[PDB]
Write a protein that binds this ligand. Structure first.
Ligand code: GDP
Ligand code: GDP
Ligand code: MG
Ligand code: MG
Lengths: 471, 465
């Protein structure tokens, strides 16, 4: 019915997640509702030892005392609940985080996430003190867990209502529980560490981001302290010593921790008022392991690579900002020649690339440099086409200020007398040609106008011939 | 000549790093070469206590025993070198990392980086065991420190790593068996085993080898020391007041062995060009790097959730632009459909973005896309125009071209107006033209407003004779 000894539930075979069918079969045979308690923390912090206490046994989850990690994967121990009749207590012992020999550092987050998803009570095991790194890791994995859970979902309860209750344990605790001159309980110490700072300013955003998350996903928190259990020369073989050879405060602290778990941990639930049993827990194991194996848990690349990308992206923005202010050398969009525009773009592009290199950091494959290159190319066509229509629009304005009076004169009839229209057009064409600061479009605008008015010239000549005969 | 007591060298004023001028002047007055030893680690790990041991004193850098952080900023203690005549030993005690009350989490990286840049021996203080998080933190800050050094440097130059301090990794409250794969190891062999890059060059190894290849490069000379729990757990709060026979005897011996190694192997701090650092040059380094940090030269390690938010939101905007670019399937008959199709396209890109977005704070990636799509709308709104003009102008050259030739011949030397009106209706009947239809025609009729009168003049003259 229940398990005399724990078994491995989830293995890391090679570097894939593998479920143990023997443990699944035993688990799915559990017909009672299950209270699931999981422990997670850095490796070599006495997690397996503490979990054996919850089972009320002296041995169980394997314990070791070298610098090397010991527990691998996630282990399962289904035992009768010692206090709640007709309930099964489900204990989950986990591979510790931060193993400096483990190549698959991302598997840490997978085990962390699985512990949050499978448990109803989550025991976060830390040493000496609350560290910001422990807070940020809980923050990061909680967000990744909620995202994965949303990618595997189909009324009013939010996803956060199904996260487990948080139990924060402090091992080898020695520092004074005193904050700003006031003595505090372990719970008040936890609250002070997790309390968002008041206000809305930028000075507070980063501090409050993980705490707003933990406040949201873990409303019910509990903190426990544990003294050093014995002299350090006796920590190896600790599980061999009877309670009267350990520190009395530690023995009582372990008892108070176990009593809280037995009295406050709840049956795991699922959306729709469903009480989880062994079979439904097996479905949760298979569901989430497959979701992780198919990529539903996001993966963040190493922080040095992410920071390099942020700095290179900033470097490209400073590069185009320096090429945009350097185009003040162009004192005129109607430039005289087109090659002077191209040369000024080249010197500005060349200067902007230097400021990019100055502000860049490990731009692998020049991927961010090539991006800047295609941006500056777009800046070339953008200035070459705005140059064209700056020449046209200015030249067209001169055609209506030099030739405007002649158009009115011809419309009146001044040149209906008995070829002196052509003579004055040529002198006004040279007038137009002498106007400084006309772009490269000058000849085109003028010739297009002369062809527009080449049909009026013929008619004026015709009329001149007709009137010559009359007298 | 030297300091009887330590002073604060760099303060945390509000949340900016500010240098204490009094300490700078005392430092710059030190004329002897300096051996600079700095300690860095998570807070409440006995850093200040251990530094007082290097000073050979029972008090010095302030020590406290509550859960709250104690040391703030960076403190400096210039003392005579205990073995080398005419040398000054410079001790740097640092604010601990990971303070859960500290809003300016980025100031951790600044203090770490300054400790690396100002020291010749770097003491990395950790508890119980070598942690992967401690390795990654050293990796990140070392890379950021080299970047800060590179942005403030302007001949056959020495490597940058050759000026980084020697690494001393201390393990406090050490209890685990120094045994790896059945073989007993020394503390140094334990450190090297933790930092040894894995062989293979495959992808399964890249992440593991990234921090270790870095630390191998910048810290070739490494040393590891273990320290037992120093005393009974009820007496740790008063450690610096207790005599040696109330501490663990192995701890007293371990502290002495640590101090002796530091004194015997630490080198005078050097700079490029065979320059030996003294008090004045150390002051110049302090001012150089503190100002560089205040001007933004030191990158900041962001929260992992924000890095994921930007990576996924950046993917979401690209997924948004993929569907608004695919919505183009230009000689359309109507102009308001241009606005209508842009509205359906802009609304479609916003909808696909939200589907793939994650923690878009301030709507910064949405608002950017909103103003981004407007530039795509206006770009197509006027590009339709110039496709209509160029087409409509082309029809004026095939419908009015023959009439223009007729006027040059003399066919209309008034029934010219009659055929212009019939060709104007011809042009108006030409299917498939945009808003420029009226534009080319009116500009053309204004171009051709002077020919009508001249032929009229000729017709009058011809009627006479
Ligand atoms: N300092 C300390 N050591 C402990 C404590 N509990 C157990 N240990 C010892 O720490 C070593 C590692 O314990 P273990 O259960 O394997 O840690 P785990 O890797 O987190 O599961 C064992 O030798 C234990 O005897 C504790 O509260 N404090
Ligand atoms: N467990 C332990 N405590 C220590 C050790 N060294 C000093 N302490 C105590 O730890 C507390 C914090 O020391 P402190 O120097 O202020 O740590 P810091 O914040 O890193 O500078 C003090 O009460 C010390 O008495 C050690 O090696 N192990
Ligand atoms: Mg274990
Ligand atoms: Mg201190």
């Amino acid at each position: 019915i229940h398990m005399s000894d724990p078994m491995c539930l989830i293995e890391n075979f090679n570097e894939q997640l593998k479920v143990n069918q023997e443990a699944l079969e035993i688990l799915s045979a559990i017909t009672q509702p299950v209270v699931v308690v999981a422990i997670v923390g850095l490796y070599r912090t006495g997690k397996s030892y503490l979990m054996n206490k919850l089972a009320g046994k002296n041995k169980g989850f394997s314990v070791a005392s070298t610098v090397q990690s010991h527990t691998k994967g996630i282990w399962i121990w289904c035992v009768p609940h010692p206090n709640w009749p007709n309930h099964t207590l489900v204990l989950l012992d986990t591979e510790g985080l931060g193993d400096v020999e483990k190549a698959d550092n991302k598997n840490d987050i997978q085990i962390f996430a699985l512990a949050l998803l499978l448990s109803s009570t989550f025991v976060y095991n830390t040493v000496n003190k609350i560290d910001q790194g422990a807070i940020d890791l809980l923050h990061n994995v909680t967000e990744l867990t909620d995202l994965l859970k949303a990618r595997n979902s189909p009324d009013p309860a939010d996803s956060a209502s199904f996260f487990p209750d948080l139990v924060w344990t402090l091992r080898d605790f020695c520092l004074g529980l005193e904050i700003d001159g006031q003595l505090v309980t372990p719970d008040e110490y936890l609250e002070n560490s997790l309390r968002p700072k008041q206000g809305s300013d930028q000075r507070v955003q980063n501090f409050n981001l993980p705490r707003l998350c933990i406040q949201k996903f873990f409303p019910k928190k509990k903190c426990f302290i544990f003294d050093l259990p014995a002299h350090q020369k006796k920590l190896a073989q600790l599980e061999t010593l009877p309670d009267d050879e350990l520190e009395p405060e530690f023995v009582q602290q372990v008892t108070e921790f176990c009593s809280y778990i037995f009295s406050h941990s709840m049956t795991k639930t699922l959306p729709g008022g469903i009480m989880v049993n062994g079979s439904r827990l097996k479905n949760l194991v298979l569901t989430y392991v497959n979701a992780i194996s198919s990529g539903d848990l996001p993966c963040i690349e190493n922080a040095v690579l992410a920071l390099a990308q942020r700095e290179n992206s900033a470097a490209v923005q400073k590069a185009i900002a320096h090429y945009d202010q350097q185009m003040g050398q162009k004192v005129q969009l109607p430039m005289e020649t087109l090659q002077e525009l191209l040369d000024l773009h080249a010197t500005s592009e060349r200067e902007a690339i230097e400021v990019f290199m100055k502000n860049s950091f490990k731009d692998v494959d020049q991927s961010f440099q090539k991006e800047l290159e295609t941006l500056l190319d777009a800046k070339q066509n953008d200035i070459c086409k705005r140059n064209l229509e700056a020449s046209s629009d200015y030249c067209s304005a001169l055609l209506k200020d030099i030739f405007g009076p002649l158009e009115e004169a011809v419309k009146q009839g001044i040149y209906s007398k008995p070829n002196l229209f052509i003579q004055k057009t040529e002198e006004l064409k040279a007038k137009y040609y002498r106007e400084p600061r006309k772009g490269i479009q000058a000849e085109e605008v003028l010739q297009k106008y002369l062809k527009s008015k080449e049909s009026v010239s013929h008619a004026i000549l015709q009329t001149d011939q007709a009137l010559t005969e009359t007298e």
